[model samples]
Target: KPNIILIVADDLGYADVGFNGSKDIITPNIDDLAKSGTSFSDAYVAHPFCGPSRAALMTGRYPHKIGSQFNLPTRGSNVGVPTDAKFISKLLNENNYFTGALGKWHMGDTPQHHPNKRGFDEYYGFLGGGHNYFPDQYQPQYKKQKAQGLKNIFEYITPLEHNGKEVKETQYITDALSREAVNFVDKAVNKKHPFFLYLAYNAPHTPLQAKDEDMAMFPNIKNKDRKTYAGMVYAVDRGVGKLVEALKKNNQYDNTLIVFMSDNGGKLSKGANNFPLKAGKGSTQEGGFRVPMLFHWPKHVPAGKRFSHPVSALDLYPTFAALAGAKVEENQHLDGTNMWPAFIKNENPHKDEPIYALRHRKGYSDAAIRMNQWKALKVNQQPWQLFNIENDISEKHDVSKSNKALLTDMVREMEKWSWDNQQPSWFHETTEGVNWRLDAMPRFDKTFKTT
Candidate 1:
């Protein structure tokens, strides 16, 4: 069996890497990886935010299906995905595959949702959505870092933990995560059974932190936020190089299946770039859900191929199962198709499957469903907006008026999904945290506009 390494980037933009028409950022490692395998031009996450998206990815089901509609609460709450939901790691572990998870686990923080408890044999990262990269911020005296004059210090800056124990992070968080991942690969290479490593890097997310050495690489980007963002992304790319190098050094390069993707679209407010695509990160537009995706297995997957059909992150679970030769029981509520056949044979896998993206909050809910090229979306009880995404990838033209029948049918499909979805298992009740959900509201404000 081949080793599987999934490297997930947090809050990455649609066009930030060299493989995706990025002219400003330097991501040679990612660029090479894209060329070395099949790249997905129309990849998407199930949700637009961190927690729900990851919940969907870990299990081969929609976040709502498993009652994880909202972002997992911070330290105080007793909330997480339902314990009944099965993680892909559990299946891989059952099949004699060594599994490890490093970096940003946002699914849940409690013992039940811990990565180690879920299926990862080893877990070396934080249990929250974000963390400060600088080591000084993690000092015992500091304990937690908060924004200036803010009464509610952000929960994202808590100390990094390893397998439920808080540990002082001595190095930059990005570098630290990469080091751990590399070390895991080094150790796992010696094991008799295949290994599955989930290297989920929390870079280019928030607290916009980057090493000085990485920042020095981009002097031309005048905008400070964008420049800092570029450096953070570069740090991840550099780490990808390290990971690839370690794999090759261990003679596990050719057969190892490496999959790289972002959790969701870029957060436009945080200096992320999702240009040429409408509103970003929190919206139902193309820019909000579409992300850069690449798969590499030099020995089996065809190199230098680009796929344009829409695919979901949920597919990773079933794909990994198929790759590892594990049989998923029929009772498993997997919402994703096994994309391995499509990747290996270069055929359309989810051509007819309607990939859905959903977000729900106290006062409202928004959802978008895409079947092939047509996309129908409704935001907060608003009339559904229909678009032929293939022709107008920017989503400037709303065809609801011209295609009422299709719009009604799609809306009905979305309504059924909403009815079937379970209520959130838990919620972030703090005012500040709930406010973050506003980003999901589709708006045409000055800062964000479709046209």
Candidate 2:
């Protein structure tokens, strides 16, 4: 059986990679994955932000269903994910794949929801939503103290986790995660077990920091924030390249299923890239949830094929589990469908059924229901906007006024879906003045347009 390696880049856009039409940034490693595998043009996250999206990813259920609809408090808090949610790692272990997670583990910080408890046999990196991109700024108290006098150590570094305890990490934070990922593969190869490595990057998310060498390469970008963001992305690409090389060296290339995607849209605050779709990150617009996805399983999937139907981040569990031959319990209750057959056939089974998404954070209004062809956006009890996505990729025009019947039908569908699958609020959401609405572009009033 083939092992599975899932690499996630935080705050990445729909078209920021060279494989996706961005000439400015050269994401050669990711591009190679796209060329050697299947690239999805309409891939989406369960939400537009970090925590909720990750909860959906880990649990194989929508964020709302898992109560991780918004960012929850960190440091032993269990606001987002419920007590009963079963993460996919459990399935991986059940299927006999040695599961390891290296890098960002934002689903939750509480011991109850930690990766080791959830399904991962081994876990490393932070448990919060984000962290300092550089090794110098990691939390001091969390540093691994066992190897105090280790050579080549940064003075002010908090050790990333080694299983449950933190340990000082070597190399940049991004590079360190890469090292762990490659090491996991090497160990798995020696042990002769199919493995699952979940590599989540906290890069290009905050603190707007980048290596001087990487920043110098993007000097033409002008804006310091964007240059730093680009540099962070470049670092991720390098890490991916290194990981791929490790797999190739171990003769695990064709025997592994490698999937690369971003958690959500780019954060405009950090100058991340999310062009041509719509508004920046932290919103429910296409720009926010629509992300890039590359699937590389050379033995199973052909290269250079692009799938354009809308698919959810929730699909990962079923897809990966199915690929690994893992059996989920009947009560697992996942919102995603297994696309293994269609993935091999180069088609999508979800073309008719719309993929649902939402973002009801404290600072933003509520939005839900997105499909390959339409979107139903809502803010509290206000009438929602139903846009024909085919004609409005940028969401430049709203057809709610023109297609009343279809809009109403879609709204009914969204409400029913939301009601059936919804769970308790992950975090108590309390914000005023259309919390989910973005102020700059088309106002919610103009887009949704009603009382």
Candidate 3:
């Protein structure tokens, strides 16, 4: 069996990396992987935010279907990813693949939701959405914040943990995660068994912090926030470079399948750039759900190629299972299609498949469905806007009025999807203002309400 490495970046924008057409930040390592692998131009995550997006990625099912529609609460809420849902790591581990998880574990925070309990054989990260980059200095301040108000206890300040135990982190959290990943790869190669490493980097996310060395690289960026964000992205690139080096050192680079992607679209308010695509993060727009997807396995996957067909985060589950020669049980209820044949043979795997994305928070709901080149999007209680995504990648025009029949049918299909999803297990106590809403657009408040 071939080794698998799934590296995820937190809140990465569509235009942040070289592969995705970034003009500001330089991500040579990540870009090199794109050049040496197959890049999916129309790839999308299941959700536009952190918690729910990650929940969907781990389970290869819609987060709403598993009652993880919103970001996990930091205090007083017992809600998390459903206990019954099995993660891909569990499947790989059972198939004799040594599994290791490093970096963010935002799905849940309780003991049951912990990564160790969830499936990973080795867990070394915080059990929340985010954490302080400088762990050594931030630990004391985090404790102080916790003491002030339990309600103020956010994940950014939560202590880092490994295998259920709190550990003092000496380096920046990003570097520390990379260090752990390299160490894991070095040891995993000698075990005589295939391994899977989920290196989830929580960089360029919220709180916008970066190390001095990384910040120095972007001296031309004047905006402190943007400069810091660039630095954070660069640090993640540096970590990826280190991991690639480790893979080469162990002579496992060509045989291992490396999958790199962002958890969701970037947070525009937090110095993220998703230009040409309307809105960023927390919205149903193309910028919110669409992200950069790169697959690299020199021995098998085609290099220097780009796939334009739309694919979902769900596809990773079945694809990886197939690569490892693992058979998913009949009752697994996976929504992802196995895209292995498409990737290896360059065939159409999800032609005309209606990939779905949904997000529910604070009594507001937004959804989008893509069928072939056509896409239908609805934000909160707004009317559905239909666009030929292939022609209008930026979603500049809405042809809903011209194509009444198609809009009606797609909206009806989306409504049926709403019925298939379960109610969120918990609600977000702290709600942000609706800044991501699309204004001035004609509202179809009277047209086929799903509520």
Candidate 4:
């Protein structure tokens, strides 16, 4: 079995890396990594935000279906993706793959949901939604708050943990996590079994922090947000570079499968450029969910090829399970089909099976569904609109006026999918959740309704 490395970026844009056509950001390592394998032009995660999107990635089911439709509540909240969901990391471990998860662990903040308890034999990262990059910047704040007997302190300032123990991290967050991954690779190569590393980098996400050296490389970027964001992204690329070095040094390069993709779309307001795609994070538009995906596995995957067919983050679950030769119980819940056989041949594995995204608002939801070429969308409780995504990548021209019947049918299908979605178990805030119940939110009757 190939050593699977699923590297996930947080809030990276479609045009943020050189492989994705970035003009200012210098992501040489990331570009080289993408060039080394097949890149998917039309790829999507299940949701538009970090938490729910990641939830889908881990569970192999849409976050909505599992009640993780929002970011995990405050840092101390005990909620997480349910235990029975059975993370692919655990399955890979059972299959004899030494699974290690580095960087962000937003799935849960408590013991039961801890990475060690879930699947990973080794874990290093923060358990909350986000963390400040530099301990120098956040540590004092956390210490002061703790000394004052504060409760529910900001998660970003919280200390990062490894196997339930806190570590005083010295390097920048990106570099620190990457170092852990490199160390893990070194350890895995000395052993007999294969390795599965989930390197979830929280770069270019929030706090807008970056190393000065990284920022120095982006002098041409005029905007502060863009400069810092570029630096943050560059750090991640640099980490990948180090990780790649580790892989090659250990003679594991050719056999390793590196799958790189963002957890969700970039936040347009935050110096993220989705470019050709409309809107940004949190929207039902293509830009919000559609992300840049690359697969680099030397001989196993075609090199320097771009696949146009839609591929979902959900597909990774079954794909990885199959790739690792893991036995998935027939009764195991899975929303994605294994696409490796068809993928290896550069074929459209999804056929016309629709990939869907739904993000809830106070009392409604913004949703999108993409079939092979046609896409159905409902935003702000509006009627369903249809787009031939093959041509209108921007969702610019709506053909719904002429294809009323088709739009209606897809909306019905989406409605059917919604029926299985569980009510969110928690929200990012107490008042927000209270308002969600007060508003009787996710009003599918109106969301699925079309003019």
Query: For each candidate, what TM-score against the reference?
Result: 0.91, 0.88, 0.92, 0.98
**2 or 4, greater by lDDT:** 4
TM-score, cand. 4 vs. native: 0.98
Residue-wise lDDT of candidate 4 within 1-451, one digit each (tens)?
A: 8999999999999899889888888899888878878889999999998989988888899998889998877646878899989999999988999989998888887789889988899899988777899989989998899999988898898888888888888889999999999999998977889999999999889879989999999888989999999999999999999999999999999999999999888997787989789988888899999999999998888888888888989999999998888877767679888988878777788896888998888878888999889988889767788899999988889899999888888888888877888888889888889989898887788888876
Which model scores highest in TM-score? 4
Against the unseen true structure, what C-alpha lDDT does each candidate score?
0.81, 0.74, 0.83, 0.88
Candidate 1 on 302-342: residue-level lDDT in tens? 78989888788989989899889999987878989898777
Q: Which segments of model 1 are wrong by more than 4 Å?
A: 140-155, 430-451
Clashing pairs in 1: none
User: After superposition, which runs of candidate 3 have C-alpha atoms over 4 Å from their true positions?
Assistant: 143-153, 361-364, 430-451
Give the higher-TM-score candidate: 2 or 3. Answer: 3
Report the C-alpha displacement of residue 101, candidate 3, in angstroms: 0.5
| Backbone atom clashes (below 3 Å) for every candidate | 0, 5, 0, 0
Q: What is the C-alpha RMSD of each candidate to the true structure, in Å?
A: 4.7, 5.4, 3.9, 1.2
Candidate 1 is scored at a TM of: 0.91
Instruction: Answer with 1 or 2, whichever has the higher lDDT.
Output: 1
